[PDB]
PDB file of N, CA and C in Angstrom:
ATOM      1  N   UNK A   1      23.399  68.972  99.415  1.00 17.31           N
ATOM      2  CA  UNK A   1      22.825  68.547 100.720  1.00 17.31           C
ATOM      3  C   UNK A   1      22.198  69.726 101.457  1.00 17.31           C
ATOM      4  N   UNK A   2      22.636  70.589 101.230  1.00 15.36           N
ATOM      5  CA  UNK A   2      22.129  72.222 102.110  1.00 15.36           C
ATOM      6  C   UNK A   2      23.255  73.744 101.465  1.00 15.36           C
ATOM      7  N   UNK A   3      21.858  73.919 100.389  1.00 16.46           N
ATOM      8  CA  UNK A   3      22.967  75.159  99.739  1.00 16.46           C
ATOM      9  C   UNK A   3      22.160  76.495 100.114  1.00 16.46           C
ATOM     10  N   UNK A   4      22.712  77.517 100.589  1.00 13.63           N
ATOM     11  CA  UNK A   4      21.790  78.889 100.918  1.00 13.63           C
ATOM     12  C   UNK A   4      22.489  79.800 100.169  1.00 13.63           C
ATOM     13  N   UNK A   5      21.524  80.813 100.095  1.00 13.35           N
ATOM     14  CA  UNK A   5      21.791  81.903  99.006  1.00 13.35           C
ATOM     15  C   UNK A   5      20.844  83.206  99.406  1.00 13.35           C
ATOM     16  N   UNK A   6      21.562  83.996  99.252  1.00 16.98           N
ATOM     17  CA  UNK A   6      20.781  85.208  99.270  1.00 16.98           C
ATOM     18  C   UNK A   6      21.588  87.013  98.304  1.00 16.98           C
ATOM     19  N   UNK A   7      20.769  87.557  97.784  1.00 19.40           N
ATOM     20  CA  UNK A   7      20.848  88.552  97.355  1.00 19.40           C
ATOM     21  C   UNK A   7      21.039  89.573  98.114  1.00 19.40           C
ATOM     22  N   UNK A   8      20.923  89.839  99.637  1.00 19.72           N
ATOM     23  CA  UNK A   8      21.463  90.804 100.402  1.00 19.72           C
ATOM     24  C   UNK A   8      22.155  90.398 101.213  1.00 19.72           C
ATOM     25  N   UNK A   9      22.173  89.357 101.600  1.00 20.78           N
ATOM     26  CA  UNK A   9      23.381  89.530 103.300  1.00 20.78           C
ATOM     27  C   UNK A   9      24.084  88.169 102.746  1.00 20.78           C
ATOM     28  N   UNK A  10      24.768  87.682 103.282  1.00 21.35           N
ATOM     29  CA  UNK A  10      25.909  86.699 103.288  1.00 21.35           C
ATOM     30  C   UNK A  10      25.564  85.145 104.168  1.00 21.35           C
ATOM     31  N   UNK A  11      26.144  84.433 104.085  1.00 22.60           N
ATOM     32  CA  UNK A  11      25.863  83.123 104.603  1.00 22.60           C
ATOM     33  C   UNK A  11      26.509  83.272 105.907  1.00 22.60           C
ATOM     34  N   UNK A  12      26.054  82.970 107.295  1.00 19.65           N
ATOM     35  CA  UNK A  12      27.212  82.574 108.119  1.00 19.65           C
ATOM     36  C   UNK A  12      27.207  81.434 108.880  1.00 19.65           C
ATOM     37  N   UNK A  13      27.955  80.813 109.442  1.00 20.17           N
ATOM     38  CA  UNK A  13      28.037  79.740 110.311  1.00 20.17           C
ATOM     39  C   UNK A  13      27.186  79.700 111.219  1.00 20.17           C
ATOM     40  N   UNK A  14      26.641  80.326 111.565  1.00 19.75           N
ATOM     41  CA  UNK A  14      25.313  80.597 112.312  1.00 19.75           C
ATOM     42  C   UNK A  14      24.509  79.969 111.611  1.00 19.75           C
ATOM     43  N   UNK A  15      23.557  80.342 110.360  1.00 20.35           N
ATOM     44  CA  UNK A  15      22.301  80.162 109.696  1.00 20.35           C
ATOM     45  C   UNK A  15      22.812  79.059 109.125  1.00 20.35           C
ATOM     46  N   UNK A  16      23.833  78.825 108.747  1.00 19.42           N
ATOM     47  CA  UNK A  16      24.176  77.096 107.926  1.00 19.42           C
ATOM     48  C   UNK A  16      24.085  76.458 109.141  1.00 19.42           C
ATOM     49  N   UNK A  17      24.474  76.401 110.496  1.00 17.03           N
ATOM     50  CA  UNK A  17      24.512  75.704 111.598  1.00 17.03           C
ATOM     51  C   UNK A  17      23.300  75.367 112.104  1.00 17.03           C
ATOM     52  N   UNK A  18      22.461  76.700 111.864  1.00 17.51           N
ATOM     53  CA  UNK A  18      20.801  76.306 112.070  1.00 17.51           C
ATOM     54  C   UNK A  18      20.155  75.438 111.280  1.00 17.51           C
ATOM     55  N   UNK A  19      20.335  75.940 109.881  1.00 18.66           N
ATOM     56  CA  UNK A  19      19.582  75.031 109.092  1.00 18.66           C
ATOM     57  C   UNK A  19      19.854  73.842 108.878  1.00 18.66           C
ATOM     58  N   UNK A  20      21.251  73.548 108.912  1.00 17.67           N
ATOM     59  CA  UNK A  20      22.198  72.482 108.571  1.00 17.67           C
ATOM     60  C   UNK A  20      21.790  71.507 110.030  1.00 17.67           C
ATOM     61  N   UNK A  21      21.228  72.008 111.250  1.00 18.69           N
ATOM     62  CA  UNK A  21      21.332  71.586 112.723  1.00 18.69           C
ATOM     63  C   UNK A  21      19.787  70.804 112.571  1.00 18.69           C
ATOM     64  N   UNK A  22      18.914  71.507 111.652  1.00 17.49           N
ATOM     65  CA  UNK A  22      17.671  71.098 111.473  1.00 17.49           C
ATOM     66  C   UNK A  22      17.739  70.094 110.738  1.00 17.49           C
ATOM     67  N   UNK A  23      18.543  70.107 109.448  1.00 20.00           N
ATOM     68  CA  UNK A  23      18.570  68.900 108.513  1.00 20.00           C
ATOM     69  C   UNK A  23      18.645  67.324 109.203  1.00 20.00           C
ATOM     70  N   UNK A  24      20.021  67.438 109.942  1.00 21.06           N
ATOM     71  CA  UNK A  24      20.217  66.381 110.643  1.00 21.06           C
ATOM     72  C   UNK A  24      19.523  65.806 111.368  1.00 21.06           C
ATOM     73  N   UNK A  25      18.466  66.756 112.264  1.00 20.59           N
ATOM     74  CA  UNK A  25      17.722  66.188 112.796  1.00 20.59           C
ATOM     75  C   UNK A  25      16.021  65.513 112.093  1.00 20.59           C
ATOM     76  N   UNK A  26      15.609  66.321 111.012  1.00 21.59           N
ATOM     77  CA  UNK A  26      14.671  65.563 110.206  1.00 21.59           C
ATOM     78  C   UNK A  26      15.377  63.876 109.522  1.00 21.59           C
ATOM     79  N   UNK A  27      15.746  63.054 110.419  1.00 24.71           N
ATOM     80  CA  UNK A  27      15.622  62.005 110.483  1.00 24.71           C
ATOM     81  C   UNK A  27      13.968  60.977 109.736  1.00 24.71           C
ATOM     82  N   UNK A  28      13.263  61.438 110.468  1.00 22.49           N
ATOM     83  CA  UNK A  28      12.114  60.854 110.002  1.00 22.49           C
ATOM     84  C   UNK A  28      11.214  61.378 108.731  1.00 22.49           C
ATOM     85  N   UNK A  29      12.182  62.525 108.227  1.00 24.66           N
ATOM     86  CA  UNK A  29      11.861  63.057 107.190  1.00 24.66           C
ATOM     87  C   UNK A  29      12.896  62.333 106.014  1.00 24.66           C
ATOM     88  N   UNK A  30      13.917  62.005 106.595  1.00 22.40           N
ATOM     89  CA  UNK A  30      14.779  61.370 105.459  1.00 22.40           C
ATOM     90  C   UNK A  30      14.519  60.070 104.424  1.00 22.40           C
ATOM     91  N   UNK A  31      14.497  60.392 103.662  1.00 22.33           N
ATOM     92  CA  UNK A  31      13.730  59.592 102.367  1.00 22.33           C
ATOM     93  C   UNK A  31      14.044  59.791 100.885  1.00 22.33           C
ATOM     94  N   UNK A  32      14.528  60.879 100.537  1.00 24.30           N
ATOM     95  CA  UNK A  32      14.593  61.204  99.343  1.00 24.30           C
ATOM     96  C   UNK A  32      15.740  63.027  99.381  1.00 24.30           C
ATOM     97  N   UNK A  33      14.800  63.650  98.732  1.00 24.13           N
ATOM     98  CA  UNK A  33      15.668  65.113  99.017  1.00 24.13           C
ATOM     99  C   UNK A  33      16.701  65.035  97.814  1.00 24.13           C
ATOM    100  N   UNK A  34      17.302  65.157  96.979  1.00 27.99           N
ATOM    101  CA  UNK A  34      18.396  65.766  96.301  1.00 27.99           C
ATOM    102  C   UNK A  34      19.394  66.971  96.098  1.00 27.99           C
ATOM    103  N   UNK A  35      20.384  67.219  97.060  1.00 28.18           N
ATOM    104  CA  UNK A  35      20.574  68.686  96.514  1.00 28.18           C
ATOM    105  C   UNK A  35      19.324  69.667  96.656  1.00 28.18           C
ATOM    106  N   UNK A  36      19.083  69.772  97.761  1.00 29.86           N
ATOM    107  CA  UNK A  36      18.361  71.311  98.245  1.00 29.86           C
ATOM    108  C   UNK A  36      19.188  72.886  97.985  1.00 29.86           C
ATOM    109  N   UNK A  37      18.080  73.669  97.710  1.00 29.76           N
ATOM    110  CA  UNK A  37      18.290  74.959  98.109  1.00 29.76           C
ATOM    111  C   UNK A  37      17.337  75.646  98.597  1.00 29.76           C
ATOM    112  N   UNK A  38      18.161  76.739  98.950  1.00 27.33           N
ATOM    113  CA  UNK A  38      17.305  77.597 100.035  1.00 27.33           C
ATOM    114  C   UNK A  38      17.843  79.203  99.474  1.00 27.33           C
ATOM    115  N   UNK A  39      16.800  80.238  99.791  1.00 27.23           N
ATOM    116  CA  UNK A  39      17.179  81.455  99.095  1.00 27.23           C
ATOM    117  C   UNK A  39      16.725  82.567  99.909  1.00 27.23           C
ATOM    118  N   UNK A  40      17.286  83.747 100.436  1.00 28.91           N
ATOM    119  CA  UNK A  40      16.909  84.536 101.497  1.00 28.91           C
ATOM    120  C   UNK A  40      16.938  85.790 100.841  1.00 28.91           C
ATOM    121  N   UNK A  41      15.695  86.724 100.774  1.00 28.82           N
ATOM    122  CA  UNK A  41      15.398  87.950 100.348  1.00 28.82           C
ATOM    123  C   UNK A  41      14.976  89.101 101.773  1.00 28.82           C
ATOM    124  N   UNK A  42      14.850  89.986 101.428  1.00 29.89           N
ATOM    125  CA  UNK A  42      14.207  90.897 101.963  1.00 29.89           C
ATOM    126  C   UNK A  42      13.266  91.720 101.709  1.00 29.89           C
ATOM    127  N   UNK A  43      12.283  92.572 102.246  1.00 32.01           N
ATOM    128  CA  UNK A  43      11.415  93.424 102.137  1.00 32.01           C
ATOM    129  C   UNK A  43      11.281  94.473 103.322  1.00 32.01           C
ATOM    130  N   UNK A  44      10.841  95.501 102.666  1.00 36.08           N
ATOM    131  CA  UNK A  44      10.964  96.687 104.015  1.00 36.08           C
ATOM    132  C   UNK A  44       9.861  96.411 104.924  1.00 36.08           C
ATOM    133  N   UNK A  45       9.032  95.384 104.217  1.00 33.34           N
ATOM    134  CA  UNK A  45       8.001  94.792 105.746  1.00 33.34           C
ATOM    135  C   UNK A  45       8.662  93.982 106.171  1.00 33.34           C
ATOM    136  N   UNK A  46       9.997  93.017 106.212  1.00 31.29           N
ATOM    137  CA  UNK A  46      10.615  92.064 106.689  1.00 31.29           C
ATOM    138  C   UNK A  46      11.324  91.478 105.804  1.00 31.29           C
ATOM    139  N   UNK A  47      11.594  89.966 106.304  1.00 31.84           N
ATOM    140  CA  UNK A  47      12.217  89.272 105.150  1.00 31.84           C
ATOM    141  C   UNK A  47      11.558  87.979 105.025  1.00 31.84           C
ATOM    142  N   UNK A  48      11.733  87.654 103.709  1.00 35.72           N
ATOM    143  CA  UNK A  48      11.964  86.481 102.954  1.00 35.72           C
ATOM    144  C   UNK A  48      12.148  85.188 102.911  1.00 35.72           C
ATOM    145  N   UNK A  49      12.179  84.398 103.016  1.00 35.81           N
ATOM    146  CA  UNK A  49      12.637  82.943 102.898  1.00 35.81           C
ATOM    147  C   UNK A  49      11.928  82.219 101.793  1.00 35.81           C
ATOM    148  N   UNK A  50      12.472  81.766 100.817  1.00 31.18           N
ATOM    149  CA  UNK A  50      12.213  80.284  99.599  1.00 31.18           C
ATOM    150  C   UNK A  50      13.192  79.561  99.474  1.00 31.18           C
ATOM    151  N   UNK A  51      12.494  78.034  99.546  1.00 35.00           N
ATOM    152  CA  UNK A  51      13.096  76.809  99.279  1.00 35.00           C
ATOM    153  C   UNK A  51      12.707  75.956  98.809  1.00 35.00           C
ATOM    154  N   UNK A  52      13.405  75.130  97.279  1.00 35.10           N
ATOM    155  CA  UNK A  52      13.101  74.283  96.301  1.00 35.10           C
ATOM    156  C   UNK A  52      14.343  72.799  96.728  1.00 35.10           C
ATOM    157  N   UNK A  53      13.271  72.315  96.885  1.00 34.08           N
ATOM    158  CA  UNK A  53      13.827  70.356  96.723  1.00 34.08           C
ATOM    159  C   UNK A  53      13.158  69.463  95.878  1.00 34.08           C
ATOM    160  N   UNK A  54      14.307  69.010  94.919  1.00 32.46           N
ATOM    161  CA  UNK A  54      13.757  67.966  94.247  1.00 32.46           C
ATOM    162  C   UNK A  54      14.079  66.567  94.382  1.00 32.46           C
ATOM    163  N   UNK A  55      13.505  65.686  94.327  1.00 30.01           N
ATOM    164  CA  UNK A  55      13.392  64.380  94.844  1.00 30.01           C
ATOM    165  C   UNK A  55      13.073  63.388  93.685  1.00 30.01           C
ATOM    166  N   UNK A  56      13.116  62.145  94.240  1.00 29.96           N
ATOM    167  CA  UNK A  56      12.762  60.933  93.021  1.00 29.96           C
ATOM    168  C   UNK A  56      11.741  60.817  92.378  1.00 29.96           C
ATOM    169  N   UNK A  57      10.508  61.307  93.485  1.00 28.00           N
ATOM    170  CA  UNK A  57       9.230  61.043  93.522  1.00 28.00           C
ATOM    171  C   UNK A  57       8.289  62.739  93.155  1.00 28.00           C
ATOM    172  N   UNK A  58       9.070  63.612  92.892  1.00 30.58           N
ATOM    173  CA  UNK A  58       8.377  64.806  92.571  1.00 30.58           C
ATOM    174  C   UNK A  58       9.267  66.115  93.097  1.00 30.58           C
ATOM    175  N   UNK A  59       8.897  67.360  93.254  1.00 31.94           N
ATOM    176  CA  UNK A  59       9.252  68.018  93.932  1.00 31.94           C
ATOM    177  C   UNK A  59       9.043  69.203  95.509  1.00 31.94           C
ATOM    178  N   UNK A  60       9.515  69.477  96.218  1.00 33.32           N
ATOM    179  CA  UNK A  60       8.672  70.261  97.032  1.00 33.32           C
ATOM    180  C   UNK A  60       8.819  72.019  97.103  1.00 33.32           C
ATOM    181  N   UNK A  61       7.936  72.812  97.928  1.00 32.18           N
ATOM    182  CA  UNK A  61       8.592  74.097  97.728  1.00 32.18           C
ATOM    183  C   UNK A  61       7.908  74.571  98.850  1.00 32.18           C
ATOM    184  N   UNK A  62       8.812  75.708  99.595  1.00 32.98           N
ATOM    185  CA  UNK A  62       7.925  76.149 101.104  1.00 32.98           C
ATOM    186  C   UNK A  62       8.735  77.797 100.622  1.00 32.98           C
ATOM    187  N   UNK A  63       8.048  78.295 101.389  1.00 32.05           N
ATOM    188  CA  UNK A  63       8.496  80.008 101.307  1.00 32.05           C
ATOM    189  C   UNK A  63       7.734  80.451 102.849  1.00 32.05           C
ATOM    190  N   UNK A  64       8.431  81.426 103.620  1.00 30.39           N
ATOM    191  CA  UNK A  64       8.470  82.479 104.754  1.00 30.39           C
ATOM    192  C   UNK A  64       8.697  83.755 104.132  1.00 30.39           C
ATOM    193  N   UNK A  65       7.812  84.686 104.824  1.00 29.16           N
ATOM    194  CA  UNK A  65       7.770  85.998 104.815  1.00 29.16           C
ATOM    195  C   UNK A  65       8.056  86.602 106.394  1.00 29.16           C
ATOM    196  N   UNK A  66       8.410  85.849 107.303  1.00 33.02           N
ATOM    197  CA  UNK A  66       7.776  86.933 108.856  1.00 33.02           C
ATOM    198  C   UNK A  66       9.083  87.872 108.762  1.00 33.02           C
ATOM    199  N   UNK A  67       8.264  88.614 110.153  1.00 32.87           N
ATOM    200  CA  UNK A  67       9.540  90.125 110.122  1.00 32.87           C
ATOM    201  C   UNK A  67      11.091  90.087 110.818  1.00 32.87           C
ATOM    202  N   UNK A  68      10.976  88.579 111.073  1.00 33.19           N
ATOM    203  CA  UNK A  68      12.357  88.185 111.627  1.00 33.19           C
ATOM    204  C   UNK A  68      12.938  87.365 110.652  1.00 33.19           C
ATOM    205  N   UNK A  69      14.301  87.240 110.381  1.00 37.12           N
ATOM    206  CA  UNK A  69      14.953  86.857 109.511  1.00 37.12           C
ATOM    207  C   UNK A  69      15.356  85.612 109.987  1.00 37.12           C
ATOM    208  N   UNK A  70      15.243  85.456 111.248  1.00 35.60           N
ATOM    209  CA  UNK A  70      15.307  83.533 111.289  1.00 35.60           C
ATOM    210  C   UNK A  70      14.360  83.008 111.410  1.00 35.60           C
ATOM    211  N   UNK A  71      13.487  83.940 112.276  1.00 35.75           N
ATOM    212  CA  UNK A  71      11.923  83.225 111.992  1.00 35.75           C
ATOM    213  C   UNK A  71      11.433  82.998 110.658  1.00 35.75           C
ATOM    214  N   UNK A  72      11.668  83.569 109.557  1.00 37.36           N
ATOM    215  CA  UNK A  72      11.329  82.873 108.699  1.00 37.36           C
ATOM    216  C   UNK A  72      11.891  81.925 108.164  1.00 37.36           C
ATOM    217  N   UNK A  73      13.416  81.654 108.069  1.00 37.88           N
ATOM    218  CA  UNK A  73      13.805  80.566 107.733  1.00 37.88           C
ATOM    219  C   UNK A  73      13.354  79.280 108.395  1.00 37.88           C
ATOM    220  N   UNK A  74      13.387  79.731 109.856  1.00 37.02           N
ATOM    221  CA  UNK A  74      12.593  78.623 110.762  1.00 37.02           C
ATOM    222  C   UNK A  74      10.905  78.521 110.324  1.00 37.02           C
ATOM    223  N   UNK A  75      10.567  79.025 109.854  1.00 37.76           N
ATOM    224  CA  UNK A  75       8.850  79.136 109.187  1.00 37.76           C
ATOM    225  C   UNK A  75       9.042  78.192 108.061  1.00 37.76           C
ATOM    226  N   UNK A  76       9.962  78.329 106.674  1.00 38.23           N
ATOM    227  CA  UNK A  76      10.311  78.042 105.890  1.00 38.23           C
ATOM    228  C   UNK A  76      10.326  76.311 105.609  1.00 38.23           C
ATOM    229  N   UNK A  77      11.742  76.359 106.407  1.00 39.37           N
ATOM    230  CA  UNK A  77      11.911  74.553 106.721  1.00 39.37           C
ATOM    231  C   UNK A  77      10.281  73.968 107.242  1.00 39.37           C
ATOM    232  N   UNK A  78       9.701  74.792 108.207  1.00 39.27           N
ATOM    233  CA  UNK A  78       8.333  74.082 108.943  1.00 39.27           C
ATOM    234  C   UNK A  78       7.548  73.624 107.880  1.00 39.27           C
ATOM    235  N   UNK A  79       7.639  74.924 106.680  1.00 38.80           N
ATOM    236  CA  UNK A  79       6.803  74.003 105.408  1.00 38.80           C
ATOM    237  C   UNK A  79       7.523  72.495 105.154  1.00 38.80           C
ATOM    238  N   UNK A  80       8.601  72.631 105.056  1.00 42.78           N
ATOM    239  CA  UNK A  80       9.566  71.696 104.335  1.00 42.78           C
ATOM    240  C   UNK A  80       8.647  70.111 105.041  1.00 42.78           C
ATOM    241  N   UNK A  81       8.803  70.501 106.287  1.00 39.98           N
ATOM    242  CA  UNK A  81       8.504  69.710 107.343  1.00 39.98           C
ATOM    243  C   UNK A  81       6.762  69.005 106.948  1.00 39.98           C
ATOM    244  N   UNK A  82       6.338  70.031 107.205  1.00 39.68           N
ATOM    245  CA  UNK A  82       4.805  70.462 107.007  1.00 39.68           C
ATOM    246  C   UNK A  82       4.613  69.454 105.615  1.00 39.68           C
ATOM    247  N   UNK A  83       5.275  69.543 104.221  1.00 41.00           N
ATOM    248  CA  UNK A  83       4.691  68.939 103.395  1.00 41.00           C
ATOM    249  C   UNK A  83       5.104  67.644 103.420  1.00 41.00           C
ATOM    250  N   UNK A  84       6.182  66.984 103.869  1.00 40.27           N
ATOM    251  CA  UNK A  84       6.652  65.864 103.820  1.00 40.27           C
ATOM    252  C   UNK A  84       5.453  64.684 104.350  1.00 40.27           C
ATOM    253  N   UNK A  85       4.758  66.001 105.493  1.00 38.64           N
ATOM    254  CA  UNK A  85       3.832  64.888 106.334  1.00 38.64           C
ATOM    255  C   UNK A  85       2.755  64.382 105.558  1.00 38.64           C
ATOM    256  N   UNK A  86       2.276  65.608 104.784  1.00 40.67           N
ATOM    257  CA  UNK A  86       1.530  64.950 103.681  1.00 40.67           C
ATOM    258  C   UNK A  86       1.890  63.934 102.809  1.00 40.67           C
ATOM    259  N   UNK A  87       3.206  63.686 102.652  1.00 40.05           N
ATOM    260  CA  UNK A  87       3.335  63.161 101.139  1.00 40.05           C
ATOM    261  C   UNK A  87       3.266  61.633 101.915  1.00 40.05           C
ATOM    262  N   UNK A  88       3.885  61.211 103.349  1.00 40.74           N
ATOM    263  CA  UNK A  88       3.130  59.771 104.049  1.00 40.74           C
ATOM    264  C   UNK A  88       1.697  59.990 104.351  1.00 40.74           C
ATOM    265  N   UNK A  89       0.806  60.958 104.293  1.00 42.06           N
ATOM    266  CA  UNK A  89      -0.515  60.833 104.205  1.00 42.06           C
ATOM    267  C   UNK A  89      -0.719  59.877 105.500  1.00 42.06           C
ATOM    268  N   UNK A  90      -2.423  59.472 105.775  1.00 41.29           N
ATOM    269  CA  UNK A  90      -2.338  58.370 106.606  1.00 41.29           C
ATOM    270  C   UNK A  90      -4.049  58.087 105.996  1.00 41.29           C
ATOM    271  N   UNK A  91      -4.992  59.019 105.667  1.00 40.74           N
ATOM    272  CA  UNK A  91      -5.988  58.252 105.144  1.00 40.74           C
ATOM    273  C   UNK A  91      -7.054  58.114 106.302  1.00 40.74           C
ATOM    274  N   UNK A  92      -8.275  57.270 105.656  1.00 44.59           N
ATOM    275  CA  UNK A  92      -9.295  56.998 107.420  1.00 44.59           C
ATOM    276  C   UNK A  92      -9.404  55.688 107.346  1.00 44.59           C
ATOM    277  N   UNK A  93      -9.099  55.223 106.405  1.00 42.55           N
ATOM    278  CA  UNK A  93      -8.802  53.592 106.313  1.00 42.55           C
ATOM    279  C   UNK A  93     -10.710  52.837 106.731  1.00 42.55           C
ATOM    280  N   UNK A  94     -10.854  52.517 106.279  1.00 47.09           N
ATOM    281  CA  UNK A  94     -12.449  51.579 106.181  1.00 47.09           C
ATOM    282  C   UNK A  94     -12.662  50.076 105.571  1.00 47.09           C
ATOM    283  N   UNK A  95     -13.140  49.172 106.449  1.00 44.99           N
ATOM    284  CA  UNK A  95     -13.220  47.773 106.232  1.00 44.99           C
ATOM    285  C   UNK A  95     -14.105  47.350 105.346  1.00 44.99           C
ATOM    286  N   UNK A  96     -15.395  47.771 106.446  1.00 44.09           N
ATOM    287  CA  UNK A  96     -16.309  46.761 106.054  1.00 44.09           C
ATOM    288  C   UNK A  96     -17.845  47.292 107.390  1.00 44.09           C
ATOM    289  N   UNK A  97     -18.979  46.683 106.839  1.00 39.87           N
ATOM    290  CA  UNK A  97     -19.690  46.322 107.834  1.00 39.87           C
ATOM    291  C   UNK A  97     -19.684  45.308 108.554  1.00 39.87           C
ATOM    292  N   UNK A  98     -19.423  43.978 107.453  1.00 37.59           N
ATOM    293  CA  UNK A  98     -19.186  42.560 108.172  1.00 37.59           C
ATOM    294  C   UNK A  98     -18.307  41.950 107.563  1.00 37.59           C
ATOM    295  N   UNK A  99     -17.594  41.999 106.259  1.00 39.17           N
ATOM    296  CA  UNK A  99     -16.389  41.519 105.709  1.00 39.17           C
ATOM    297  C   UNK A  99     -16.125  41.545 104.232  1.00 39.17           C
ATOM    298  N   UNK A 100     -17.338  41.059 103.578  1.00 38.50           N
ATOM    299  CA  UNK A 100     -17.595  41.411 102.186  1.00 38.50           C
ATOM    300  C   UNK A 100     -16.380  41.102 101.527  1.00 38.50           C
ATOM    301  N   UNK A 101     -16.169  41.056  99.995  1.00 39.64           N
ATOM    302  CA  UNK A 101     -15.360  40.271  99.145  1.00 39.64           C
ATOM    303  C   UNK A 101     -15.165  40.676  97.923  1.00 39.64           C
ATOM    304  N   UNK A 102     -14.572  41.816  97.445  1.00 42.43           N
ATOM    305  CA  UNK A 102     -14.370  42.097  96.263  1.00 42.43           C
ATOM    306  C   UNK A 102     -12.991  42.544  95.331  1.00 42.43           C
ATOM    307  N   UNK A 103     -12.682  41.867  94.564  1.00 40.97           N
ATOM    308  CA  UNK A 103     -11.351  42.096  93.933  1.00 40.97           C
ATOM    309  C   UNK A 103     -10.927  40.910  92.306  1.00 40.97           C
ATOM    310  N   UNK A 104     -10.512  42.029  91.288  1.00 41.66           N
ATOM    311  CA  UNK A 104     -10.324  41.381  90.475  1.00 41.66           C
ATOM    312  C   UNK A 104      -9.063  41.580  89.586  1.00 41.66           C
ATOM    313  N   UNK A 105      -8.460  40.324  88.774  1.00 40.07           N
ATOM    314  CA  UNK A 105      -7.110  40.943  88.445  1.00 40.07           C
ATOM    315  C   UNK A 105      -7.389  40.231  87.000  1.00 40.07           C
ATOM    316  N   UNK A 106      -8.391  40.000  86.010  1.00 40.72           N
ATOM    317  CA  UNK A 106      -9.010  39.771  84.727  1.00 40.72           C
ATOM    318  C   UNK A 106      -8.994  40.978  83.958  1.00 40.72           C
ATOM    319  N   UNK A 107      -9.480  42.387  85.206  1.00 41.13           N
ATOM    320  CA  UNK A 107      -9.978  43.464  84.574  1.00 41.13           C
ATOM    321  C   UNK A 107     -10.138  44.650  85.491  1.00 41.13           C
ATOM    322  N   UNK A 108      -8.722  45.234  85.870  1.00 42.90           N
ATOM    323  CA  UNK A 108      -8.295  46.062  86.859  1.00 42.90           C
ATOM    324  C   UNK A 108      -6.628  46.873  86.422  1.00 42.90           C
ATOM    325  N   UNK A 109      -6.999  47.090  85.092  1.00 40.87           N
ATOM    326  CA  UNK A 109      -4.988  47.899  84.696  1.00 40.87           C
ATOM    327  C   UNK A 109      -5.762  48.323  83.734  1.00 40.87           C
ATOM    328  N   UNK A 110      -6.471  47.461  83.139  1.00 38.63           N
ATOM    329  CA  UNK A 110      -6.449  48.178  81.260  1.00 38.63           C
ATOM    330  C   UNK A 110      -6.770  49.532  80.938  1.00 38.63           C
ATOM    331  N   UNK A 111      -8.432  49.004  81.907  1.00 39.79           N
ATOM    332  CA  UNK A 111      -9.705  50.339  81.840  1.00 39.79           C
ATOM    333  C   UNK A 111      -9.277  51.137  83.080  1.00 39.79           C
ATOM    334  N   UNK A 112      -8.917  50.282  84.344  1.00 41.04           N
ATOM    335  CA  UNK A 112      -8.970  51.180  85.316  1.00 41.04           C
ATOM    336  C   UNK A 112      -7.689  51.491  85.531  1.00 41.04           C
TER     337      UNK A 112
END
């Protein structure tokens, strides 16, 4: 549900409380998700953040670099956030000029 990891510093009730505080609230993101992780690095320009979720329907992946170490986790999830919106899409949606009539189910799977 929310696993973190990192190669230099340690997990604390803090950053699970954040991220874990965010989960709960992506409500309208809830749909799928399996067993997430999340992975926290560093660099002497800052730090790090990557995160892999896999789902029914495919998988996702967001990564942070900024020079604050929660700002990027908070950057991180925003992808998380950020791609979900894509994956409901919304499209420009188009009718018609005046109503027109076309559709066939003879010859619409095979070829197309």
């Amino acid at each position: 549900t929310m696993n973190i990891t990192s190669k230099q510093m340690e997990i604390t009730p803090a950053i699970r409380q954040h991220v874990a505080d965010r989960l709960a609230k992506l409500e309208k993101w809830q749909t799928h998700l399996i067993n997430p992780h999340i992975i926290l690095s560093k660099e002497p320009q800052g730090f790090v953040a990557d995160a892999t979720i896999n789902t029914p329907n495919g998988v996702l992946v967001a990564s942070g670099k900024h020079e604050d170490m929660y700002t990027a986790i908070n950057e991180l999830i925003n992808k998380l956030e950020r791609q979900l919106n894509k994956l409901q899409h919304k499209g420009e949606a188009r009718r018609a000029a005046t109503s027109v009539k076309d559709a066939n189910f003879v010859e619409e799977v095979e070829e197309e």
